[PDB]
Amino acid sequence: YKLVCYYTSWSQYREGDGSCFPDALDRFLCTHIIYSFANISNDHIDTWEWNDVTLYGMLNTLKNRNPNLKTLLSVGGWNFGSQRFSKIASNTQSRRTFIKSVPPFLRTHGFDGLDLAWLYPGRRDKQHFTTLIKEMKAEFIKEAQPGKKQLLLSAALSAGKVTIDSSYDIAKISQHLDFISIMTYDFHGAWRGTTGHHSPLFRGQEDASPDRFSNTDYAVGYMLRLGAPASKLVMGIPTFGRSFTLASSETGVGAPISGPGIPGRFTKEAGTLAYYEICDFLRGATVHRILGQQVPYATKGNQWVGYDDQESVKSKVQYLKDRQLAGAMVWALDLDDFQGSFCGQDLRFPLTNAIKDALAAT
Amino acid sequence: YKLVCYYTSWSQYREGDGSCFPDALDRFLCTHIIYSFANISNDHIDTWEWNDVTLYGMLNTLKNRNPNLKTLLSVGGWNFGSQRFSKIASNTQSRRTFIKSVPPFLRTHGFDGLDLAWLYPGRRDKQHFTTLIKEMKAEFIKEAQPGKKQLLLSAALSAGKVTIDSSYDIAKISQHLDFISIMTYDFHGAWRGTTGHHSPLFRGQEDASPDRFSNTDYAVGYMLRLGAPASKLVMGIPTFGRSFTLASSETGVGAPISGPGIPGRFTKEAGTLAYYEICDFLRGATVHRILGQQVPYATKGNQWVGYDDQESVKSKVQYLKDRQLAGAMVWALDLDDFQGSFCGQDLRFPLTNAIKDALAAT
Amino acid sequence: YKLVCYYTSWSQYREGDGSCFPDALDRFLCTHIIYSFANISNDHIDTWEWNDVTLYGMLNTLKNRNPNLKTLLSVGGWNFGSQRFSKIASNTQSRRTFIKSVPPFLRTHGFDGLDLAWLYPGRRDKQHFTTLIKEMKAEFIKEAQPGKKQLLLSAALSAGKVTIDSSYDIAKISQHLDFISIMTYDFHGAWRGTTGHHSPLFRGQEDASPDRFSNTDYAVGYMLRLGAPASKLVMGIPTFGRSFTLASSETGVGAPISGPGIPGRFTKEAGTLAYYEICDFLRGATVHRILGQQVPYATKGNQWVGYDDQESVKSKVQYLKDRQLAGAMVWALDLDDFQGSFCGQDLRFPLTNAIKDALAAT
Amino acid sequence: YKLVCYYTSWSQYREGDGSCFPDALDRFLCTHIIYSFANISNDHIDTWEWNDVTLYGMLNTLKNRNPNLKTLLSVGGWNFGSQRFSKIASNTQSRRTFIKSVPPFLRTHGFDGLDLAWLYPGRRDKQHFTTLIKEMKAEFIKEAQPGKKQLLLSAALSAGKVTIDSSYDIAKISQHLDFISIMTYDFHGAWRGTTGHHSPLFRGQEDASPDRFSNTDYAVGYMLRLGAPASKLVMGIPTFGRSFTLASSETGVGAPISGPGIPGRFTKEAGTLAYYEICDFLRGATVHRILGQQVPYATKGNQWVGYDDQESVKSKVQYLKDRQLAGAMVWALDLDDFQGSFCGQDLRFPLTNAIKDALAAT
Numbered sequence A, B, C, D: 001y002k003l004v005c006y007y008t009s010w011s012q013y014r015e016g017d018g019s020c021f022p023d024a025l026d027r028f029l030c031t032h033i034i035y036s037f038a039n040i041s042n043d044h045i046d047t048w049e050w051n052d053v054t055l056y057g058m059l060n061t062l063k064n065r066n067p068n069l070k071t072l073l074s075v076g077g078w079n080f081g082s083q084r085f086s087k088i089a090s091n092t093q094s095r096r097t098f099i100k101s102v103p104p105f106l107r108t109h110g111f112d113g114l115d116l117a118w119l120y121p122g123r124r125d126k127q128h129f130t131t132l133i134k135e136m137k138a139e140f141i142k143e144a145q146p147g148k149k150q151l152l153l154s155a156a157l158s159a160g161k162v163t164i165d166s167s168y169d170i171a172k173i174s175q176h177l178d179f180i181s182i183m184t185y186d187f188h189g190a191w192r193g194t195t196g197h198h199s200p201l202f203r204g205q206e207d208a209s210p211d212r213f214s215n216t217d218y219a220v221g222y223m224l225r226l227g228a229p230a231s232k233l234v235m236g237i238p239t240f241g242r243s244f245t246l247a248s249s250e251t252g253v254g255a256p257i258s259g260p261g262i263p264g265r266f267t268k269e270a271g272t273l274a275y276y277e278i279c280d281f282l283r284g285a286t287v288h289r290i291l292g293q294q295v296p297y298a299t300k301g302n303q304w305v306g307y308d309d310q311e312s313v314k315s316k317v318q319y320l321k322d323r324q325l326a327g328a329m330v331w332a333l334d335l336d337d338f339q340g341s342f343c344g345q346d347l348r349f350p351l352t353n354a355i356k357d358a359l360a361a362t
């Protein structure tokens, strides 16, 4: 089973124990470690952080004691911007320039492939997106013909029905992508006005959630139906939780909230909490395993965080193995308890190690 | 909470360890023990089995050490005959004789009330089935008026949506009934040619499911939605399992079957298995928990059986308490392991007890 | 058969033949004419437009040469505030003030009753909405007891399942209201990115529709199913259409759009078109009757509009009669071709009259 | 567009004007005519009727004036039996003989190809079927490699979901079939106990029919999504109706029935009525266009029949062209008023010619 893992280039700028660099990663932990993100400056694939070229190294050095580890540089990401990408892909001009720059840059940097993280193609870029991947793959071949090891091409697609529909021609692109990562998380926003787990495995109580398709099972399922093969499907699994600030003494699912949740001391970003920050939170908190959804949420004071733990990621892995999917995708190494400290026990990458073990065992 | 348990009056004619009598029941176990079924002969409520009077005897004795235990006589039942019931429902005189015959018959025999087990009113009986309940309650009130402890009136209702829409006016009946037991089991017929748990808590995997309403959760929310007060809703929980005979090596949910499972040694009814027989079956068997449904199934050789155990009833109880229901109803005590034997430890009524415990434990 | 027609107070300000005043309405056309909308200022039901008092009189005049026309004052409306209305229903004191102020304001200004257009009660206002409807009917009773002709109480409910599920306890409110108007229209938002009739009668082609509940039939049947007396259900039918702007040369249902259609010279609101404006659009347009849904749509150049016409409303009246519903509701009189010029024959209210005629014949 | 029309071999043994012979068929009517059915005296496709070999000619003579019509011989039918086919195709040896024995038979009898009517393949026949069609086409090429015009190979398949899943590898079988006639009719059995059109276009009113997939629209789309190519999909249209015998004064859709309708004069088979018997029945009868399904049901006295008229088959034709299908299929040429006397006009094949005109017109 393929175990895809992300690393963000911005997890370095975090206070004390929170800062994370490519060298803090377990060489043997994943089958694919993806660097994110990569910018596109002048229809070309450029670095992002000033030291991205150093870090690109710190990461590839992990291949040294483990030649099985593969790596991909992800281009795009939430920030980049939907429009920027849109243009660079619409005309054939910039599109060829870009496709062109990719192969060498990756080569001259120790990367085993490319990860397309366009978020997301308007309904107007669906045909384009298809081409962009068709051609980009055509190119990846034109380079490896000299006898090299061909560069891997993947994409992080949305898991929400609407988008999946108004942006992807799964049946087609599924052919050129070496594997797909369905980002099955970020399903219940603070705008809804109620508490909701952002990454539930199943729908759960039929009338406790607005629609039937804001969960992992539906997404995974829906996409298989649209033609995506199982062998090219990696199921995303967040190692972060989405929080809210309650507005009443009520604390169950669908309870009233008044905004996202207070910012973690390290990731500092209302609505988010890294697993290691959740671990602190837990002390004195009250955990509730949501029945039909197979995931846990914790509450304490006026805070409510829906997340995943070892038990839930394990459930989640058993789920994918069943559907006999390509494997799990994590987001992101730097959000799990990579130190090994916070969640105690001294062992590190708990949620990802749970995912790792569950994948290899029946 | 209410813990309504059913006791079938034919569980006596069961070979050796199978045979079950009113006296073999834990008088402290339930809050209401319903005896079933009673016939309606000559538009008069009347006994069924040659020795019912003796059994109404053994059962009602259980109220001695435990004065809080209530008992009711259930009239109707699956084999009774859907037609025969309507006949009495729509005859202005048939109904009247019937209603008038109950109060005396109950006081004469020791019951605290009646329970309507009409399966199932037709689309044409929706109204007759509402009048019935309405007048019967009147008769219970008229008889009690002097200063007596009023006779209890309940109805066991279908969990099948189609049935609920064609046969009931939940809205109205709900007010004249003391409680409503919703038969939330028997959801997956063998005629589908595929294995399926007959009593899932939730729908489970979105596509592996037949429809959208063959699971406890839907059934409850629908009835609550339709008007039945939570305080009057009893959630049906089966202590028997639904078996299928496999047709291949596939053993998962949806596997192909060639017919109902093999009859039990004691229940002798293809497609059915008492929990105590499921326990003999479990020896050398493989049990799997169905992820999306919170219920488990077990397979061995060419038999597949979906049933409930301590774990699943606990969740179902957790579920019902969350929904703030009136309690759980069990069908039936003579299908739970009542000798205590069959499942080790030799403790009696594992299922009901597990339910009892979970009902008063938070 | 009841024929409830809405008259908006803002259609008075439209340019040219668009300006619509109460005295421009056919006094024999409808059975009930609801004036909309009225504000609630300082917990008191009040006028909205500076000259509401003048217009109320122009409307109520119509009752003269015809003493069977009933009129109502609709309070609420889309532009009112799901929140403002909530704080008045939640506060026990505010609720009384309001309820108390209605009978006088109603008798004073010459109205037959009230119409509640709270769009829409939150997940948390379900019971408050019921209480609010309960107590207001309790007042219209008290005020009429001396011997007066009881003030009428109605409500314009959502046709959308999600909304209906989180705000309406149909069973209960349905017994206090005199009739319910189900707004069966506004079903395919332009956000979907695709063309789609906003008021289909049935789902039509299965895989060409977004969901199973966005159509009249489902809504009508869902409410009936939920306990609303057909005798009290008024099926809304729209005299306006919802436009879009095509992004390609594709013009059938499901074609990609780039946003709402161009605004009309008179209604001047993107994505909306009154019928009389549609009659203008049809000049050199191409009308197609969507088969599975019984409703038309027209397209010309890059505009696409899904509306209702005489043939389609007739089908709709047929559908409601087979269903045995209290009648039809029309939103709005001023969006129909009230002048009678645009749509030919110089006959006025072509759509509404078609509705009336169809109701009258069997 | 193709136009496959079947001919029954038993359409001769019928009284008076009800006798149908190959020489009675309009040679410029269909583009294909499938003689049905043909037996197999154990691994060798042997005729069925004593004069079968005489009729094969009568049909074929129709090629003399219209050299551009083709004929296939259909082997199977409803009576051939489920087991006979399975047992004959399951035996690797038994098969070969059959496959090998088909071509020479057709070639010697003027038939241009085969048609497979296996009703139906259980779960234990899915692959066999796939193979049978596979190897079957293989042989057709071999025999035709000299320079001869190749033999066609079509298949009549169930339009019912459950049947399709449990037995059709649409993805594969479709690459070998020159075309697929989807038997989109026979949805409502008399076992249901209520009236219902056996061949609706769309499901119509949501709570007036059991499931979402017992109509033409669903079946087709379902098939298309399963891999069936619109270019290789012929949609069946029935030229007969399905009668029921009413049990009360209710005559609408879903009114109670007490068995199938009285046998037709000429077809002499309960629950069935050919169009010519229907046209007759229609005198003094009342027709009703079922609103959501685009189909008529007529009722007179205690009889109820749902069927297709010119108006409705034309709608279904517009439907398939919208779905860009291979064409329409009919059943059967001897059920349509081939006489031209029953439906008056003195014109022949009223429905099929309506189907034809409609196919080439827009």
Ligand SMILES: CC(=O)N[C@@H]1[C@@H](O)[C@H](O[C@@H]2O[C@H](CO)[C@@H](O[C@@H]3O[C@H](CO)[C@@H](O[C@@H]4O[C@H](CO)[C@@H](O)[C@H](O)[C@H]4NC(C)=O)[C@H](O)[C@H]3NC(C)=O)[C@H](O)[C@H]2NC(C)=O)[C@@H](CO)O[C@H]1O
Residues within 6 Å of the ligand: A076, A077, A078, A079, A080, A117, A119, A156, A157, A158, A159, A160, A161, A163, A183, A185, A186, A187, A189, A214, A240, A269, A272, A331
């Ligand atoms: C069900 C549905 O469709 N709902 C919509 C939501 O999907 C959507 O939310 C956005 O969802 C995307 C993925 O679907 C998400 O981005 C991916 O996931 C991670 C984690 O959120 C992102 O990581 C962030 O990266 C940025 C830099 O670009 C950092 O600034 C930020 O700190 C990171 N946050 C975390 C938790 O790590 C990645 O960018 C991306 N991963 C990959 C491989 O592409 C967006 O973050 C979601 N939006 C946010 C910020 O909440 C939502 C949009 O608001 O709309 C719903 O309708």
Ligand SMILES: CC(=O)N[C@@H]1[C@@H](O)[C@H](O[C@@H]2O[C@H](CO)[C@@H](O[C@@H]3O[C@H](CO)[C@@H](O[C@@H]4O[C@H](CO)[C@@H](O)[C@H](O)[C@H]4NC(C)=O)[C@H](O)[C@H]3NC(C)=O)[C@H](O)[C@H]2NC(C)=O)[C@@H](CO)O[C@H]1O
Residues within 6 Å of the ligand: B006, B077, B078, B079, B080, B117, B119, B156, B157, B158, B159, B160, B161, B162, B163, B183, B186, B187, B189, B214, B240, B269, B272, B331, B332, B335
């Ligand atoms: C979703 C849906 O619509 N499901 C339909 C099923 O409801 C229906 O199957 C019948 O379901 C009812 C419960 O609603 C069931 O009867 C009740 O439940 C128990 C459990 O079966 C019955 O026990 C049997 O009693 C008879 C005598 O009355 C005995 O002969 C038999 O041995 C008993 N079996 C067991 C396991 O104990 C009770 O009769 C009754 N209990 C109460 C409280 O009233 C029927 O038995 C189910 N039918 C059968 C025989 O399977 C199904 C129609 O068959 O249709 C589904 O769609």
Ligand SMILES: CC(=O)N[C@@H]1[C@@H](O)[C@H](O[C@@H]2O[C@H](CO)[C@@H](O[C@@H]3O[C@H](CO)[C@@H](O[C@@H]4O[C@H](CO)[C@@H](O)[C@H](O)[C@H]4NC(C)=O)[C@H](O)[C@H]3NC(C)=O)[C@H](O)[C@H]2NC(C)=O)[C@@H](CO)O[C@H]1O
Residues within 6 Å of the ligand: C006, C037, C077, C078, C079, C080, C117, C119, C156, C158, C159, C160, C161, C163, C183, C185, C186, C187, C189, C214, C240, C269, C272, C331, C332, C335
């Ligand atoms: C299936 C589903 O749930 N869809 C949701 C939509 O229903 C919802 O859109 C809003 O829907 C309500 C009724 O369903 C509608 O309000 C009523 O309908 C009329 C006609 O649209 C409204 O008329 C408008 O009134 C405002 C001021 O009140 C005017 O400014 C405007 O010009 C009027 N438009 C027209 C064409 O006349 C009335 O307000 C009201 N009438 C009654 C009987 O109460 C809202 O207007 C709809 N909102 C909009 C902007 O369309 C939608 C909202 O987000 O969400 C969907 O999911």
Ligand SMILES: CC(=O)N[C@@H]1[C@@H](O)[C@H](O[C@@H]2O[C@H](CO)[C@@H](O[C@@H]3O[C@H](CO)[C@@H](O[C@@H]4O[C@H](CO)[C@@H](O)[C@H](O)[C@H]4NC(C)=O)[C@H](O)[C@H]3NC(C)=O)[C@H](O)[C@H]2NC(C)=O)[C@@H](CO)O[C@H]1O
Residues within 6 Å of the ligand: D006, D008, D077, D078, D079, D080, D117, D119, D156, D157, D158, D159, D160, D161, D163, D183, D185, D186, D187, D189, D214, D240, D269, D272, D331, D332, D335
């Ligand atoms: C949802 C679903 O799948 N529904 C099931 C039904 O399919 C099934 O009913 C049988 O359906 C098949 C079609 O799929 C039907 O046979 C075809 O259709 C015609 C007319 O139905 C048949 O014609 C008859 O043939 C027999 C002998 O072959 C003659 O004796 C008789 O005179 C003929 N009658 C007519 C109308 O001409 C054909 O045999 C066949 N056509 C082709 C090209 O293959 C069966 O007749 C249907 N069975 C009946 C008679 O009801 C049903 C089984 O009970 O189950 C549903 O669920």
Ligand SMILES: CC(=O)N[C@@H]1[C@@H](O)[C@H](O[C@@H]2O[C@H](CO)[C@@H](O[C@@H]3O[C@H](CO)[C@@H](O)[C@H](O)[C@H]3NC(C)=O)[C@H](O)[C@H]2NC(C)=O)[C@@H](CO)O[C@H]1O
Residues within 6 Å of the ligand: A013, A048, A049, A050
């Ligand atoms: C806007 C963005 O890309 N994200 C921000 C980060 O880039 C930023 O990191 C800091 O970047 C600057 C360069 O832009 C680093 O400064 C460099 O420091 C080295 C020290 O050896 C020196 O040789 C360079 O001259 C100097 N760069 C220049 C030319 O200015 C700085 O070290 C980075 N931060 C640190 C201390 O690691 C951080 C803020 O620091 O914010 C991100 O949002």
Ligand SMILES: CC(=O)N[C@@H]1[C@@H](O)[C@H](O[C@@H]2O[C@H](CO)[C@@H](O[C@@H]3O[C@H](CO)[C@@H](O)[C@H](O)[C@H]3NC(C)=O)[C@H](O)[C@H]2NC(C)=O)[C@@H](CO)O[C@H]1O
Residues within 6 Å of the ligand: B013, B048, B049, B050
């Ligand atoms: C169809 C039905 O009601 N259920 C069946 C049971 O009735 C049946 O049980 C036996 O029924 C007979 C007849 O009612 C019983 O006979 C009576 O036995 C007593 C014993 O003291 C005797 O005094 C009576 O004279 C005698 N009466 C009759 C009518 O003959 C018999 O005791 C019952 N035996 C059992 C098992 O208790 C069983 C047969 O095993 O099958 C049920 O399906």
Ligand SMILES: CC(=O)N[C@@H]1[C@@H](O)[C@H](O[C@@H]2O[C@H](CO)[C@@H](O[C@@H]3O[C@H](CO)[C@@H](O)[C@H](O)[C@H]3NC(C)=O)[C@H](O)[C@H]2NC(C)=O)[C@@H](CO)O[C@H]1O
Residues within 6 Å of the ligand: C013, C048, C049, C050
């Ligand atoms: C926001 C709103 O209520 N809708 C807008 C309308 O109010 C507006 O109508 C105009 O409103 C003004 C203010 O009420 C009217 O002025 C009044 O004119 C009469 C004339 O006899 C005079 O007696 C009043 O004193 C005066 N009111 C005061 C105190 O200012 C004005 O006549 C209205 N215009 C007309 C003729 O319709 C319209 C204008 O476009 O827009 C609505 O959106």
Ligand SMILES: CC(=O)N[C@@H]1[C@@H](O)[C@H](O[C@@H]2O[C@H](CO)[C@@H](O[C@@H]3O[C@H](CO)[C@@H](O)[C@H](O)[C@H]3NC(C)=O)[C@H](O)[C@H]2NC(C)=O)[C@@H](CO)O[C@H]1O
Residues within 6 Å of the ligand: D012, D013, D048, D049, D050
């Ligand atoms: C079992 C079967 O094939 N289905 C039955 C039909 O065969 C049957 O039709 C009649 O079949 C007989 C043959 O069995 C025909 O008789 C033939 O008549 C000709 C006259 O020229 C004579 O030369 C033949 O020798 C003779 N057959 C023999 C060898 O005995 C008879 O004409 C057929 N009837 C018709 C209408 O043509 C029908 C009804 O009889 O029932 C089917 O079940």
Ligand SMILES: *[C@@H]1O[C@H](CO)[C@@H](O)[C@H](O)[C@H]1NC(C)=O
Residues within 6 Å of the ligand: A039, A040, A041, A042, A047, A048, A049
């Ligand atoms: C990415 O490229 C854009 C376009 O040239 C540029 O404006 C931006 O600075 C680049 N991103 C960063 C911050 O390196």
Ligand SMILES: *[C@@H]1O[C@H](CO)[C@@H](O)[C@H](O)[C@H]1NC(C)=O
Residues within 6 Å of the ligand: B039, B040, B041, B042, B043, B047, B048
């Ligand atoms: C039930 O009563 C009816 C008389 O109304 C009778 O026909 C039937 O045999 C009785 N069944 C039993 C076993 O008592």
Ligand SMILES: *[C@@H]1O[C@H](CO)[C@@H](O)[C@H](O)[C@H]1NC(C)=O
Residues within 6 Å of the ligand: C039, C040, C041, C042, C043, C047, C048
């Ligand atoms: C409606 O009443 C509210 C509160 O009294 C007020 O703020 C608002 O301006 C009023 N609207 C109009 C136009 O009367």
Ligand SMILES: *[C@@H]1O[C@H](CO)[C@@H](O)[C@H](O)[C@H]1NC(C)=O
Residues within 6 Å of the ligand: D039, D040, D041, D042, D046, D047, D048, D049
């Ligand atoms: C072949 O068809 C004939 C009809 O003439 C039938 O009687 C026979 O049973 C079929 N197969 C055999 C050889 O039995």
